[model samples]
Target: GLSAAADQTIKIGAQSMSESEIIASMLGQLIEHHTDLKTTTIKNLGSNAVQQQALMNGEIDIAATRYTGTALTGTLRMEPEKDPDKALALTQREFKKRYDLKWYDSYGFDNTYAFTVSKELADQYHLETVSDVKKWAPQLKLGVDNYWMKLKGNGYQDFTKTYGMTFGGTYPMQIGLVYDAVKSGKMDIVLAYSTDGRIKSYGLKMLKDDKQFFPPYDCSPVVPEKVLKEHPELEGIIKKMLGKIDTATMQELNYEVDGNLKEPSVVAKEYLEKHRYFES
Candidate 1:
């Protein structure tokens, strides 16, 4: 049996957004349920690069990150021999070996990448798929996050390769920055997440990813190996909590925190209690 130490603390690093905030809040509530455990959250680490650097330098114990192909090569050093499926497998092995990190089963799915255009623009161009963009490539502009612009293999590169298309120009901005650009008519099209709370809130029309260029971005925690070895009990605790989480539940929770404007900690407590995950 393991007892909590007064000095024991789990540090989590997250991006500045509702999605990252929700994950931090969930982990915090789990720690609070156990009298022996304590948690700390570091917000706005800027980008995934910063988050990965912090984890290696011991600034944070765990961080939530997407499984982009390029980053995997730098830290994990393993590339998928094939496309989507192999990428995930290689990532799992490389992460554990290189950083001594283990990824728990994913609790949420954030993989669907949507191309949004205002109903006016969509009706004018009659754009339905990536191929349609190619026909009007010179006239259309694209807005995407910096990560997507630089990403190779299964990201921006894959999208272009699959559809044989190219954009007139790309505007690089923060994750949520493009949402307003598309809505305000500053940009013709923007890339966004299917599960993003703002998508429905803003009344933007999402075009289907008919080519299936985007890969799954399942949400899971990557824990340091040292922590797991020292605290063997943590494995079971994490598994128990994560196993119960799913895409629908995650979307709803994000809506509650982001859409409804509720405190993250409060939402987390209610969710844990409802699921009977609290340990007395």
Candidate 2:
């Protein structure tokens, strides 16, 4: 059997046991299956700051990250382009120049924040769109992840500002806890991501972002430029992995990981083989 001969290890860093961890796990599996890649994982840490520090200090090979308002300031400039694809291109260019890193696009969209309600509330109110939520905002309780509360220019903010809506009050919770809140009927509505596996599993209703407040959050792998230069073969390997990924497939994978309690590495391998990314 032909095998990858490169003797290198990939370290992935994530904040907590949420989507970022899921992405890190998938990336690890892809590298292990396609190359002689070993992985080191750091979890339960802060996100943007930790990833930036690790990558800049050369402590990790890749960092799973998201765009935050804070990231737009100073050294990290937000790509001004609104089109998702173009924004990604601009971001890649800046990242490459600033940190000399390369990115491998992933099969996930981590930024599509959605408005979710309890199945009962959704049925009772007959809600279908952000406009519907806006009408009910003053009376209904809203739950937000701590990160969302701090975010300035995020989708949640845009929805509220554009619709001139304000929640009765805000409840701060972690991602998993927030999901549980809606499922348990502790909150009337909450902010969620489109690809969150719990949306379907918990029987929550996803109100439409009819206002187009949220932007695309295409996931991809980010590697140091030095690594890419040394291993040009990686371009083909990465392309093979990313080319087969899309938003729907990623949602299904998230379901498998979060809903079915399957290991991400196992799920990733199955997806690769099913998609024929691997050939014997």
Candidate 3:
């Protein structure tokens, strides 16, 4: 059995993005509220590679979230897997065996890359999926991350070949600005993160990739086993978040931070309070 008077503090890692910050805040809040342990968040680590390194170096006890498909290709150095469940299971097993880390169930959202369009455009064109946009593809101005433009297999080239459609013009710009560009009518269609809050804030619709063009990117918290060994109670606390948040709820939560400019901690506290910490 674990002894008392052990480590009294836990550290969480977060990316620069608001969604990561918000989720990290939520995890930290849950730990503080439910346990005697105090919590700290190491924010703006920049990317998954950095976060993973921090975890290995014991710089953080937990990573706020990790993407299944992303970790598969990046951390595990495996090819992309399109099936969400398969990808998630593979990541869970691999992380456990390789790094002695635990990957919890997804928060119920897949924040993968997606094509988004203004609601007006979707309605006018009756477009519900990437394939549906083919008819008007030649007239739509596409805005995408400059990096995605040059990506090999899943790049615009493969996309055009797979969908048999090409945009009238393509604007490669910063990924963060694409949401606003489409919202302001600067572009007719843009590739953006599927779970970005700006999609809701701007009333943009993420068209379905019916052909599963991109790999599934399911989000979940990850923790090293050493942390769990010291604080076994954390297992239950982290598990409480399983399937707790859906895509729409996540969008609103993120919007509260990104679009509304609320503090991530405040947004997290309010969200937990509103949901009563998922307690009955």
Evaluated with lDDT, which candidate comes out highest? 3
Error of 3 at 91 (Å): 1.1
Clashing pairs in 1: none
Ranking by TM-score: 3, 2, 1
What is the Cα-based lDDT of residue 269 in candidate 1? 72
Task: For model 2, state the Cα shift of residue 138 in Å.
Answer: 2.2
User: Which pairs clash inside model 2?
Assistant: 100-225, 104-221, 105-220, 106-219, 106-220
Poorly placed runs, candidate 1 (over 4 Å) = 1-6, 65-74, 80-86, 119-126, 152-164, 278-280
- Per-residue lDDT of candidate 3, residues 130-207 (tens digit): 989888889899999767776665678778888899999999986678998999998999999887888875789989
lDDT of each model, Cα atoms only? 0.69, 0.68, 0.87
The residue-by-residue lDDT of candidate 1 on 1-280, one tens digit each, is: 3454445887877777667777777776676665466788888777556777887788887775444443454355444343545666667777777777776656646445678887777788887776666787777788887687676555677678788888888888876677788988888889876666666667677887676555555566677887777666567766656546665676677678767888766777788888777453
Q: What is the lDDT of residue 266 in candidate 3?
A: 99
Give the lDDT of residue 112 in candidate 3.
Answer: 82
TM-score per prediction, in order, is: 0.81, 0.82, 0.86
Model 1 alpha-carbon miss at residue 219, Å: 2.0
User: Model 3: what TM-score?
Assistant: 0.86
Model 1 scores a C-alpha lDDT of 0.69
Alpha carbon deviation, residue 202, candidate 2 (Å): 2.5
Off by over 4 Å in 3: 1-8, 132-140, 145-175
